[PDB]
Amino acid sequence: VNRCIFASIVSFDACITYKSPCSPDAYHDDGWFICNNHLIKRFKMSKMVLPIFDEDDNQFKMTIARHLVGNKERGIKRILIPSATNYQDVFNLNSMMQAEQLIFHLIYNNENAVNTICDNLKYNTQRVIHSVYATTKSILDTTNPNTFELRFFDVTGAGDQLFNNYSGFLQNLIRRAVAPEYLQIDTEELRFRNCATCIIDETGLVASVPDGPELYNPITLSGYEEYPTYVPLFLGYQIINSENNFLR
Amino acid sequence: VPVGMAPRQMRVNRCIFASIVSFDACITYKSPCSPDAYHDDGWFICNNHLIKRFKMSKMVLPIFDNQFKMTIARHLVGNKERGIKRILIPSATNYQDVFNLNSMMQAEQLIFHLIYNNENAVNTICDNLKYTNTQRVIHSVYATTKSILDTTNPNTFCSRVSRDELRFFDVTNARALRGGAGDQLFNNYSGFLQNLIRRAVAPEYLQIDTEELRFRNCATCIIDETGLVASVPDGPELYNPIRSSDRELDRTLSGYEEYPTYVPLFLGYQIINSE
Amino acid sequence: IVNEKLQKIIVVTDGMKRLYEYCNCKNSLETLPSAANYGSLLKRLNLYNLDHIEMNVNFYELLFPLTLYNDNDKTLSHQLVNYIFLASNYFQNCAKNFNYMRETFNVFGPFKQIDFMVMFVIKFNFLCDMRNFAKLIDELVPNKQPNMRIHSVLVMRDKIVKLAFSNLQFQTFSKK
Amino acid sequence: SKDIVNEKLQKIIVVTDGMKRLYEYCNCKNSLETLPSAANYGSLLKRLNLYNLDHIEMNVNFYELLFPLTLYNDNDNSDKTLSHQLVNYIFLASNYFQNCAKNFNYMRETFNVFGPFKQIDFMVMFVIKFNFLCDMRNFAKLIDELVPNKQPNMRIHSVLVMRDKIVKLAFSNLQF
Ligand SMILES: [Zn+2]
Ligand SMILES: [Zn+2]
């Protein structure tokens, strides 16, 4: 048992390829709905976590993603998560399988393209595509808040509005990857970064910084430990409500 | 029964405070030194003394395919620390205040005086230790400390320190007024002090000929009259979970190359070129 | 002539401020020029065609005269370097977001010469900051016989600024 | 936009026509074949000495100087050798500027022989730029007034970018 968006791509056709490129972390039932391979190859991110402190013995592994975008990328190459207006542009819809194209159309609310592809693929393909629909929609609904913590991405609300514009799965992905520079722990505000490492805009999520050049991010002191050079994603201001050390 | 061949060559402790010894011949003492002091690295202080006195711990930043790993230190100043607590490295004008010299070994007091010049106090201590064996300890401590100081001594030659690099750690905050002066004070800073600052504080940007690599878009520490201050330039201090020295969610979250919780030292541009 | 450049810079800046009836040196800047400050400047500029506008600043030579000041005493030795890095970052941001700058300024009363206007406001704001710095250092005496070793940093930052302007120019030209 | 660039092209033609007689030089026989020599400007150097020459930029905006020429009716689909000729022209201009920058000192001694005056540091660059602009005028004569409002050409723009980067770096390297 595992979980991976785009792993629902069943061989509906006999056209191009499929081999199930799914990282083993899909079995890890984390808060993510996507595994490392898919995350890396569709958003230029790497899954990561972060402990906090043992003052109150919390040390919670805060979820966070790693930038995979160097300082030479521009525009599309720097966009991490595209908006519904640009996901089609950034993604080579002609390269990925029609199953993944359908997944993108659904997650970005492009049911017109969804039905177009369904009709085209009808000429067992239809039932396999319906199975893909079932899996993708189940994942989307699970992520969707609309069913049976003031993580502002603008206060450190246009940015929060854009995040809301994103779908349930997309919003979950954004909140899992991005990490607010500020986190309140129920009436104690803690700052963890003095600066941002990403920006949310109309195009979507961009591995950019407020000012200056882009953070450098490439792909005999043996007697000392190391500090990672990559840039984790950081943006926003989150407030934890009236709740205890909710290690649940 | 007894066995011996000849005098032997062994390792060298490179931290200044390793020379700390009780002025007593009748009362033995051994300073606590981390084995790292025996690495032929720029660090002329061992991790133990560094954490104990400057509230700093050694770290490596492996910048890279052309990987040129470089040294760096990190904060150990708590989030709630304020004022004098925030002075990560005191200046010569305040080191006496920051360090309770009265409560520490007189050898250590002399060492700190040497680091911050204070030749008057140095001479007073030497006279006191002479007019009382103790002269031998004078010789040992002062010779070792002065040797290390002259070795650092960036503003000389024959010392193997100056790389002709033009790091500007006084680089403007971009919102302060015409100012800085951190490098002015640096010029005044002792040679060992300057080298320690260089090694510990990594530059925000690395400038190579026509290449500028960005590693931290906001400095984590500042330099002022008091010395090195572990203060966020823009106000609200970063959270620092001091752990040592001085649940089911995590179990679910298996290892994911968890990012460190520390706050390394980032400040300035480091300028190196082929010319 | 190794010293007349500074005084001529002062004089030409004064004459240009006269010509375009604008000397708003008060709004010192360190983030990005904005129509919120230079809207009236845009209107004044619209009076005369801005043909003589360059896609570069010649960073090195532009800031070279500031070195002439005597700093025997240090103040300038560090304030000038601070200014060099500040100018480098300022031009970096200006070139990086020139499209954003120009959409903003155009939204402020669209001008047929919008690109000229944005470039001129960048130049004018930089000149205002430079003149303020020059007043800060008016006490020191400019003269030749230089030996700095920081003009190497000036050269490096000038190369960076030139490359930034180069990318900007490539974008503008390639986008038809 | 590119209409302003067409205006720039016409303006540079007319302004060359203007100064070549305001200062009556038109050393219009020379070209970019190689490094220029003071032997062809002696009298022109004398006339230059009549003016203070510090009002000149160390670097050359090779980008903005040459971009207007890129606007031409390449859609005629009759002379692609015209575009290739433009590529040759721009590349040779870049080489000319690079050699001028590399041997700028050598030209400094040349013009020390010819009119040993303090303004030689600017006279060298003025000779360089004026000979270049005479070559530009001749090239304009060669080409036809087929300038469109807008025209994209990725290859030409890329050549411009890569050659001018070298040009700007070389000019920046002129330390002092
Ligand atoms: Zn997977
Ligand atoms: Zn030690």
Short mmCIF file of N, CA, C and O and ligand atoms in Angstrom, two decimals, chain B residues 13 15 17-18 31-34 36-37 45-46 48-49, ligand 2:
data_model
loop_
_atom_site.label_atom_id
_atom_site.label_comp_id
_atom_site.label_asym_id
_atom_site.label_seq_id
_atom_site.Cartn_x
_atom_site.Cartn_y
_atom_site.Cartn_z
N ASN B 13 48.61 20.91 19.33
CA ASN B 13 47.34 21.54 19.67
C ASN B 13 47.37 22.99 19.19
O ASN B 13 48.28 23.74 19.55
N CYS B 15 44.71 25.31 19.40
CA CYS B 15 43.86 26.28 20.08
C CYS B 15 44.68 27.05 21.10
O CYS B 15 45.49 26.48 21.83
N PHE B 17 43.77 28.48 23.88
CA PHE B 17 43.47 28.17 25.27
C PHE B 17 44.04 26.84 25.73
O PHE B 17 44.01 26.56 26.93
N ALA B 18 44.55 26.01 24.81
CA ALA B 18 45.28 24.82 25.24
C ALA B 18 46.48 25.20 26.10
O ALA B 18 46.86 24.44 26.99
N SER B 31 43.46 21.72 30.82
CA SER B 31 42.40 22.47 30.18
C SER B 31 41.52 21.54 29.34
O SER B 31 42.03 20.58 28.76
N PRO B 32 40.21 21.80 29.25
CA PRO B 32 39.35 20.98 28.38
C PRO B 32 39.43 21.45 26.94
O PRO B 32 38.91 22.52 26.59
N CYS B 33 40.06 20.64 26.10
CA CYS B 33 40.28 20.97 24.69
C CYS B 33 39.70 19.88 23.81
O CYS B 33 39.92 18.69 24.06
N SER B 34 38.95 20.29 22.79
CA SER B 34 38.42 19.33 21.84
C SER B 34 39.54 18.80 20.94
O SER B 34 40.44 19.55 20.54
N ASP B 36 39.67 18.43 18.00
CA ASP B 36 39.74 19.20 16.77
C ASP B 36 40.92 20.15 16.76
O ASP B 36 41.44 20.49 15.69
N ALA B 37 41.39 20.56 17.95
CA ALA B 37 42.55 21.45 18.02
C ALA B 37 43.75 20.86 17.30
O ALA B 37 44.68 21.61 16.96
N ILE B 45 41.39 27.96 17.57
CA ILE B 45 40.68 27.75 18.82
C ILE B 45 39.91 26.44 18.69
O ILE B 45 39.34 26.16 17.63
N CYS B 46 39.87 25.66 19.76
CA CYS B 46 39.18 24.38 19.68
C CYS B 46 37.69 24.60 19.92
O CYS B 46 37.28 25.57 20.56
N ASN B 48 35.66 23.39 21.88
CA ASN B 48 35.27 23.54 23.28
C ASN B 48 35.44 24.98 23.75
O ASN B 48 34.50 25.58 24.29
N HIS B 49 36.62 25.56 23.55
CA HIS B 49 36.83 26.94 23.97
C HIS B 49 35.92 27.88 23.20
O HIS B 49 35.40 28.85 23.76
ZN ZN E 2 41.48 23.27 23.11
#
